[PDB]
Amino acid sequence: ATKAVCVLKGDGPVQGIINFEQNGPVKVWGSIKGLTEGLHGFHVHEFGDNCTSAGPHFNPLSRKHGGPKDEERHVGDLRNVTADKDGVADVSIEDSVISLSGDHCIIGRTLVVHEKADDLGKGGNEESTKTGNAGSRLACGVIGIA
Amino acid sequence: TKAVCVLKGDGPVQGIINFEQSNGPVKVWGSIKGLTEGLHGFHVHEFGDNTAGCTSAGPHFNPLSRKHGGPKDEERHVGDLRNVTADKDGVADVSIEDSVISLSGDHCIIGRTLVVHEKADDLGKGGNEESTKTGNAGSRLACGVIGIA
Ligand SMILES: [Cu+]
Ligand SMILES: [Cu+]
Ligand SMILES: [Zn+2]
Ligand SMILES: [Zn+2]
């Protein structure tokens, strides 16, 4: 019955709040503003160092980057969030790999939203297997106990 | 094990505090700028929730359900650190060691908020009710969620 929250901010105008609630799936929802219309990579990264210092995608099992439904993905690979014309992304997803307890606990890690869409590891180049070619980290926030 | 916290607020106050640690002491160090010269309250609060700025961080981390006190007092909250000291330039270079907090286990502070205050923490030695709760440290000038490093 644990809950977590992350406030996203960056150098640009992007800002948002993302909630987390949980061996059960983790429900993830909230809103992000200041985004350009389009799909945006959304991942939990390794270090809760507020966005270049966040490190790579949270990868405790040392796996290759993938999409949320792939058996091969980083624990932090959540999905692309969608921002409408008004630059707002309403987030509402359920993820089975992250957790707020145990080996895949994300409390104290960073949540990062990217400039471009995540190719989910299916891009055909090496970078795809690492970051999904999602581009700059527009905003991030440390995941905290709510 | 190592943790880091980036402190930010509505104003000039910003800093970075590192934590480095079993039951061994936790070394806390870093610097905070933009502070008025003098003492400023410094505690780990219960929640790592910054949705309302520092206001939503909750009270001081107090897993053992005790009254507020100074860091070296018998009775204190786990999150009660000593006041930080800002110099003439408004800079507080912090270097503290605490054996009550922890980066692992129960009194783990990762995921919680570090907060720096407007006034000095009176260590619970004040002449009122609130002293036993907040040390009368006043408003929260900056804060940040303690993250894994
Ligand atoms: Cu990312
Ligand atoms: Cu405080
Ligand atoms: Zn990834
Ligand atoms: Zn206290």
Side-chain angles (χ1 to χ4, degrees):
Chain A
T2 178
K3 300 179 172 188
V5 67
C6 184
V7 167
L8 295 142
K9 293 187 179 179
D11 277 5
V14 186
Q15 35 189 50
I17 293 177
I18 293 293
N19 302 283
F20 302 79
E21 166 160 56
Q22 182 173 32
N23 294 310
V26 176
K27 302 285 178 49
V28 184
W29 76 95
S31 311
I32 308 171
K33 285 75 169 190
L35 289 164
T36 51
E37 178 183 354
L39 280 60
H40 299 275
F42 190 60
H43 324 111
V44 170
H45 282 237
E46 204 123 89
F47 316 122
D49 196 324
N50 173 62
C51 301
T52 69
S53 302
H57 296 180
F58 182 35
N59 53 162
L61 308 185
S62 302
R63 288 183 299 184
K64 305 299 234 310
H65 182 72
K69 291 302 173 290
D70 287 316
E71 298 198 289
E72 180 81 358
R73 54 166 271 187
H74 293 138
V75 166
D77 301 342
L78 301 173
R79 74 203 58 172
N80 276 304
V81 302
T82 299
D84 211 347
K85 232 296 188 303
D86 63 9
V88 174
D90 289 319
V91 178
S92 182
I93 66 183
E94 173 175 296
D95 191 77
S96 291
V97 183
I98 56 169
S99 64
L100 299 183
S101 54
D103 315 6
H104 297 192
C105 179
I106 59 175
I107 291 172
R109 311 270 175 189
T110 52
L111 174 55
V112 182
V113 60
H114 291 264
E115 170 178 275
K116 299 301 187 182
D118 185 335
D119 68 28
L120 318 174
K122 263 86 79 170
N125 43 80
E126 183 185 7
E127 196 53 39
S128 185
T129 69
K130 289 163 185 180
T131 68
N133 292 291
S136 47
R137 308 184 173 180
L138 299 187
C140 49
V142 172
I143 302 175
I145 301 160
Chain B
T1 172
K2 324 180 181 292
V4 67
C5 181
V6 174
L7 301 175
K8 281 200 181 185
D10 298 316
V13 189
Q14 54 189 298
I16 287 75
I17 302 299
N18 306 276
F19 298 77
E20 171 165 287
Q21 179 180 33
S22 181
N23 294 310
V26 174
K27 295 121 176 192
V28 183
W29 82 94
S31 174
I32 304 168
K33 76 184 178 191
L35 286 171
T36 57
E37 193 187 334
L39 265 15
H40 294 285
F42 193 54
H43 330 102
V44 171
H45 284 238
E46 201 183 314
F47 307 115
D49 178 338
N50 201 75
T51 48
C54 306
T55 302
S56 43
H60 308 174
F61 186 37
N62 182 24
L64 305 186
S65 312
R66 301 194 168 165
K67 302 300 192 58
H68 178 73
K72 305 303 170 172
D73 279 304
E74 301 283 60
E75 227 220 329
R76 50 166 276 188
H77 295 142
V78 168
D80 287 343
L81 307 188
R82 72 192 228 171
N83 281 280
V84 294
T85 299
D87 64 37
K88 298 291 179 181
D89 315 310
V91 165
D93 289 303
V94 181
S95 181
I96 295 168
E97 180 178 297
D98 195 78
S99 286
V100 177
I101 57 172
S102 172
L103 297 184
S104 228
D106 296 316
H107 298 175
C108 186
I109 59 184
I110 290 181
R112 301 183 189 277
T113 290
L114 181 61
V115 180
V116 66
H117 298 253
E118 167 192 345
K119 315 169 188 171
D121 183 324
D122 73 29
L123 318 175
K125 300 181 191 175
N128 58 294
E129 186 87 291
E130 179 95 300
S131 174
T132 69
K133 295 194 60 178
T134 67
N136 292 298
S139 80
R140 302 171 190 193
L141 291 180
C143 57
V145 185
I146 302 172
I148 286 166

